[PDB]
Amino acid sequence: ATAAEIAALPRQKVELVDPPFVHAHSQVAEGGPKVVEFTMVIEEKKIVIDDAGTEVHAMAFNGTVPGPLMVVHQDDYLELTLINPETNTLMHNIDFHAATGALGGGGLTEINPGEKTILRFKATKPGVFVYHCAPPGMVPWHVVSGGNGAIMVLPREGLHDGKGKALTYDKIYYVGEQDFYVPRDENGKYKKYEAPGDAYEDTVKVMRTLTPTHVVFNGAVGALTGDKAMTAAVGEKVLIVHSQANRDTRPHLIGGHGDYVWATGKFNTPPDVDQETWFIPGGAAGAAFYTFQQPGIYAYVNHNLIEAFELGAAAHFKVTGEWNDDLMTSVLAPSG
Amino acid sequence: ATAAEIAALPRQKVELVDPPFVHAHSQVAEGGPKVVEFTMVIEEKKIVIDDAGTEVHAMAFNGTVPGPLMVVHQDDYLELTLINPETNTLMHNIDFHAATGALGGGGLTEINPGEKTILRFKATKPGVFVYHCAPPGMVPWHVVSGGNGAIMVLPREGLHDGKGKALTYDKIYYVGEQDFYVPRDENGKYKKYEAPGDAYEDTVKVMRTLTPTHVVFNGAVGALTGDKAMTAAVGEKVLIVHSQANRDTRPHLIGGHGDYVWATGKFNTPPDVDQETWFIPGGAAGAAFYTFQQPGIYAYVNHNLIEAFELGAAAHFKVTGEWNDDLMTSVLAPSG
Amino acid sequence: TAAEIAALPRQKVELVDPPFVHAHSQVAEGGPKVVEFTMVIEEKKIVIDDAGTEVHAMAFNGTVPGPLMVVHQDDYLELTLINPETNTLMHNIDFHAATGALGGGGLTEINPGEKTILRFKATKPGVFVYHCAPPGMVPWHVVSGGNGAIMVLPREGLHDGKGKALTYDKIYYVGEQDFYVPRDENGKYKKYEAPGDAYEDTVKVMRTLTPTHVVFNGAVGALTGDKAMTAAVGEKVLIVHSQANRDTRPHLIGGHGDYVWATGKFNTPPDVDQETWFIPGGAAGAAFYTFQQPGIYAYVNHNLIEAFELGAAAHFKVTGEWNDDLMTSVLAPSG
Numbered sequence A, B: 001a002t003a004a005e006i007a008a009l010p011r012q013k014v015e016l017v018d019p020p021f022v023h024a025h026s027q028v029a030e031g032g033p034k035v036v037e038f039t040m041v042i043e044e045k046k047i048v049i050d051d052a053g054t055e056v057h058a059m060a061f062n063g064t065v066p067g068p069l070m071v072v073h074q075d076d077y078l079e080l081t082l083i084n085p086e087t088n089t090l091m092h093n094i095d096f097h098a099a100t101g102a103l104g105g106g107g108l109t110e111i112n113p114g115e116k117t118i119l120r121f122k123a124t125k126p127g128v129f130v131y132h133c134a135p136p137g138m139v140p141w142h143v144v145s146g147g148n149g150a151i152m153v154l155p156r157e158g159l160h161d162g163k164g165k166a167l168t169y170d171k172i173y174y175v176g177e178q179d180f181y182v183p184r185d186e187n188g189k190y191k192k193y194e195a196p197g198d199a200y201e202d203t204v205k206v207m208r209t210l211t212p213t214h215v216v217f218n219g220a221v222g223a224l225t226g227d228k229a230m231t232a233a234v235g236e237k238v239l240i241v242h243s244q245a246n247r248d249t250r251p252h253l254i255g256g257h258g259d260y261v262w263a264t265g266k267f268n269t270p271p272d273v274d275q276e277t278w279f280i281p282g283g284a285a286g287a288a289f290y291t292f293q294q295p296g297i298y299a300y301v302n303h304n305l306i307e308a309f310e311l312g313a314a315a316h317f318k319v320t321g322e323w324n325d326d327l328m329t330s331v332l333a334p335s336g
Numbered sequence C: 001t002a003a004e005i006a007a008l009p010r011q012k013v014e015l016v017d018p019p020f021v022h023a024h025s026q027v028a029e030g031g032p033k034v035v036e037f038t039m040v041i042e043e044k045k046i047v048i049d050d051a052g053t054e055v056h057a058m059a060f061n062g063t064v065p066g067p068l069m070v071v072h073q074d075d076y077l078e079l080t081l082i083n084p085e086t087n088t089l090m091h092n093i094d095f096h097a098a099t100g101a102l103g104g105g106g107l108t109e110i111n112p113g114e115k116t117i118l119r120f121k122a123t124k125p126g127v128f129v130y131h132c133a134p135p136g137m138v139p140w141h142v143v144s145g146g147n148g149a150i151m152v153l154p155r156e157g158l159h160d161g162k163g164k165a166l167t168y169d170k171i172y173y174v175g176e177q178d179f180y181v182p183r184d185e186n187g188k189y190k191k192y193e194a195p196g197d198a199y200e201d202t203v204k205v206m207r208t209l210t211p212t213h214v215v216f217n218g219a220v221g222a223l224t225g226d227k228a229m230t231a232a233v234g235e236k237v238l239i240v241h242s243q244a245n246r247d248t249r250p251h252l253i254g255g256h257g258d259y260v261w262a263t264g265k266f267n268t269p270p271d272v273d274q275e276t277w278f279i280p281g282g283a284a285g286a287a288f289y290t291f292q293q294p295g296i297y298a299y300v301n302h303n304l305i306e307a308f309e310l311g312a313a314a315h316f317k318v319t320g321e322w323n324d325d326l327m328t329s330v331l332a333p334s335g
């Protein structure tokens, strides 16, 4: 399309919602290509990531870790207004893995505090894709400070399986998985800082060990458990988008499966089926489609169980409905 | 299916065999759906995991690390009797990745010492699947103490390749791979403990490093070597089921290939072909099919070669038969 | 038959250093050939970073990684492997592409002052690791750089899932190396007189499973600056990537993998529209991309700590015209 042609396209302004929720959208595309507009402010904020009061200087797209999921369709234009507020201390930018050229938008979106930019890219490829901050000289530091999220580029005709049967989700959740590298003192205590810059040297030392101190969902230990558990009902079709901008993960729905899993996150690559545990490399997002069959609490985990139950990479689903004794039954309950 | 229909189904009681062997089964299902019955006693026991005599307090399904492979067909019911003897000190349970609901069975199988339980589940999806102990609050500790195994749910029609050709193995082996985290003293020598509980806090410390001290097949360094080497012959078709309940692995047959590899372990997902090295994420089982073409010794390894040759993740095959100079020949043997 | 093999054409090929690849045709020309290669194993000190950090490398053909060898399915690869009397160690070679004798390693154990010639039939199409593998010292030889890759092209060249021909304009080979360099008490990398002096200290670092360096083409920044890879808008590029010991996750920052044989095997259909692909330790993968935008791209292991802190970052410098349909700055950074 020409510049004049793009300028003629319908503009639709989208209002983002916080992970793990996803803003309103249509699975099948509404008419021809549109310029879908989003705005996010990059917020620098202290976050507490565990019950010990451990702090991280987070870089939060739209105020969250991870930043929110943006949903467009293949061949829409994603037009992001990105804003760096005056109260911030650092330059920030954005690399969209979905985009083509200028380091994913990174080379065109470098904003100092008090600056804004507007980037437009054509979403030519269907899938779930990571985005992250990537300032030259400080790339992994910003990323492991929570400066990442994802987008979903839906096929204009919605999702399908390998064979062409439509796959339509009733619910969609976005899990952003985060590896943190929090410096400790000589007593094994996590250190605190009064400015993001103050933690830099200490953090880089920990980063180089390639061993995170915490691995969490939605920015904290227990962020997606208890009250903040994701919800479903027996018979509901759920899509779980999962991203990790820096480090590998192996998602697993304990009590469930991934009926269809785009493990690479790309919708033109046919999904794997009947998955127990899938694998998403650092720097990617994946998506799993499941229909719930049993009510109760599920644990959705990074299935390195040390990472899940020692380091924080565990979420819950709360599922309502009738128990199915055909699928599973206790023939003899625990007894002498 | 109703309770009355299931009650009407035939029962078979299977005798489990120790890994790497697999109990007598048929690849193609004989008859309609059965209720397949297994019994396992969990043993808390001291095991030696290397030639130095390093010991671990293991949690051992059926007394072995890994626990034995259970084999059923799709839409069979698996009915496990699980026994926690009174000589044990901890509660145990079981999560079948093959199963649907109650945390894979974990929520219905919490047994204290002196207790037993019977769990039935419908095997709705064909593939190889991990099972493991998963007691709330102590999940990874039990798993990395050896408390894991696998099952195989064969399609009723046996195995096929991606494209409708039947694949029939002559023999099957199950390689359970285990990451162990053994505390060291101030001179780097492995510590021993009187009771399982004594080791807990030191072991958690090593676990948090995400660096296993040992990575072994069938419970110990070199367990599948010497007169315990796996065997085949030229022309023989071998299925190799491989599981890792906690940590990623990258299986490789040195001198051979994976002709068909269900790297995700799920038989409705078409296998990769002509593989050098496949990838099995932590919390999953995979399976490779190979037809041996050359006689001699092969090493079957996790192809992080440090993990293979320093940490313990190497097995051998001894293969009998005639050498094929077409496939490979020494034109000029090592000479001055 | 014996005569049929004996009668097949023999052809000598000259190797070139990574990231470049020797002359080859994508579509096989004629029937099966015996393609002849020669490599001299060089034990040599190499510098791997900007602080002058040294490794006693084992370098097939004098390079880390060793060079890419290219043949076609059902060709034979016939390698003459030479271990100079000036070397101190025995070496051999395991071809993951080959069948038997531990990939060739059991037939190629050559002491200093020896050579050997190995022939194998390249029965399966794909990119495959090769590495040194002396019994009992396998990982030490591999993490000292003694590894490379080969490509076994389908006789009919590459195809997509629908069997449409994929023809590259150029090919690069990125060999990724995990190094495990000992440090003294003050955190300074140690140096050693002979390779064997470093053995015990090196194995200690190896057991932490934590590399000190993760590099492309044998050194931090080897494929950046005046040594960036190059392309033009519209140009079709195959990037072959190997890691003989440790997982990696390649990502073309600014680009994609249009077709990615993540397993490296050409009979396994490629994944498409890839953001970041995954290559397990002990394998090679291949990605096909058609550049759409000019500029600098970063080609990385997308554990960004490995990429930017440990060395796993390369560049592409791409010429041609910007495409505003694909991407445009609507409002440039402004106060």
Ligand SMILES: [Cu+]
Pocket (backbone or CB within 6 Å): A059, A091, A092, A093, A133, A134, A135, A142, A147
């Ligand atoms: Cu940034």
Ligand SMILES: [Cu+]
Pocket (backbone or CB within 6 Å): A059, A091, A092, A093, A133, A134, A135, A142, A147
């Ligand atoms: Cu940032």
Ligand SMILES: [Cu+]
Pocket (backbone or CB within 6 Å): A095, A097, A130, A132, A283, C251, C253, C302
């Ligand atoms: Cu990225």
Ligand SMILES: [Cu+]
Pocket (backbone or CB within 6 Å): B059, B091, B092, B093, B133, B134, B135, B142, B147
């Ligand atoms: Cu247990």
Ligand SMILES: [Cu+]
Pocket (backbone or CB within 6 Å): B059, B091, B092, B093, B133, B134, B135, B142, B147
């Ligand atoms: Cu347990």
Ligand SMILES: [Cu+]
Pocket (backbone or CB within 6 Å): A252, A254, A303, B095, B097, B130, B132, B283
């Ligand atoms: Cu599990």
Ligand SMILES: [Cu+]
Pocket (backbone or CB within 6 Å): C058, C090, C091, C092, C132, C133, C134, C141, C146
């Ligand atoms: Cu060597």
Ligand SMILES: [Cu+]
Pocket (backbone or CB within 6 Å): C089, C090, C134, C137, C141
């Ligand atoms: Cu050696």
Ligand SMILES: [Cu+]
Pocket (backbone or CB within 6 Å): B252, B254, B303, C094, C096, C129, C131, C282
């Ligand atoms: Cu190898």
